[PDB]
Structure 1
Amino acid sequence: KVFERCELARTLKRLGMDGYRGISLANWMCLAKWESGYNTRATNYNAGDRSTDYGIFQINSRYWCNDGKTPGAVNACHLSCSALLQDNIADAVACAKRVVRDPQGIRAWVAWRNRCQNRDVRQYVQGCGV
């Protein structure tokens, strides 16, 4: 599914993402916008290293989920990458929380560094009631 902006903001809030490990909801929204356009079924194959990015946060198979076809990969979220393609984003959120329990935090997604870091991200949650 493709979420509408404020629908996603409230969904993420109910799932406990506002301020998780210090990360504001607006940062999570900025991440989802630029990774996938709020699209839970999005996939991106990385021919360079044979990994694939999955779902609304475009979480990568080399480290975070298992798809069986990524060489020398691990599965730190202990999920099938299929779980990151559901309309219900609970599992994707659990995995995103696992990602940011590691040292880099939200910087684990390079797109966040390029599109959200040191930026005014307040627009992504304006009007959503969060």
Structure 2
Amino acid sequence: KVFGRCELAAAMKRHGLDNYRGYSLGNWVCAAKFESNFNTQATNRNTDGSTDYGILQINSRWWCNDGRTPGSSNLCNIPCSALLSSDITASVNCAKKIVSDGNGMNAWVAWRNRCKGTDVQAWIRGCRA
């Protein structure tokens, strides 16, 4: 599924991301835009052999099991394929574990490079609300 900007903001809010660990909703919407262009089916393979999955590009080195990343953990206790669902529950639950790991949203490279320090409230502007 390809979310609309406000549709995703609403789904994230419902799932408890607004101000989670102090990150306002616009941060999460900005991170999803630049990691996946709001597409739940996005995948990208990394040079180390791990793959990133879903709307928040969650990595198989640490967080999910895809059966093809030998050095790896599955800290979210889920198949990586679950992160590709039209239902973002699995992604959000895993993202909450990631953001609590010590580096905050810096875990997401696109957030650090494209959202951090910018006017992120613009991402929820106009949404109901």
Fold match by TM threshold 0.5: yes
Superposition deviation, residue 119 in structure 1: 0.9
- Structure 2 unaligned segments of length 5 or more: list them: none
Distance 2:105 2:63 in 1: 14
Q: Deviations over 1:47-70 (max 9, x none)?
A: x10000000000100011110101
Superposed CA RMSD in Å reads 0.7
Superposition deviation, residue 129 in structure 1: 2.1
Q: TM-score, normalised by structure 2?
A: 0.98
State how 1:1-130 maps to structure 2 within 5 Å. 1-46=1-46, 48-130=47-129
Q: Which moved more, 1:120-129 or 1:32-41?
A: 120-129
Superposition deviation, residue 101 in structure 1: 1.1
Q: Following TM superposition, where does structure 1 have runs of at least 4 consecutive aligned residues deviating by more than 3 angstroms?
A: none
Distance 2:99 2:10 in 1: 20
Distance 1:71 1:49 in 2: 10
- Secondary structure at the residue paired with 2:44? strand
Q: How many residues align?
A: 129
Q: Deviations over 1:89-113 (max 9, x none)?
A: 0011000001011100111111111
**Identity within the alignment, %:** 60
Write the letter of the residue equivalent to 2:11.
T
Q: Deviations over 1:23-79 (max 9, x none)?
A: 110000000000001100000011x10000000000100011110101201011111
Q: TM-score, normalised by structure 1?
A: 0.97
Distance 2:63 2:23 in 1: 19
Distance 1:24 1:82 in 2: 27
- Secondary structure at the residue paired with 1:111? helix
Distance 1:75 1:109 in 2: 18
Distance 1:100 1:76 in 2: 13
Distance 2:105 2:77 in 1: 19
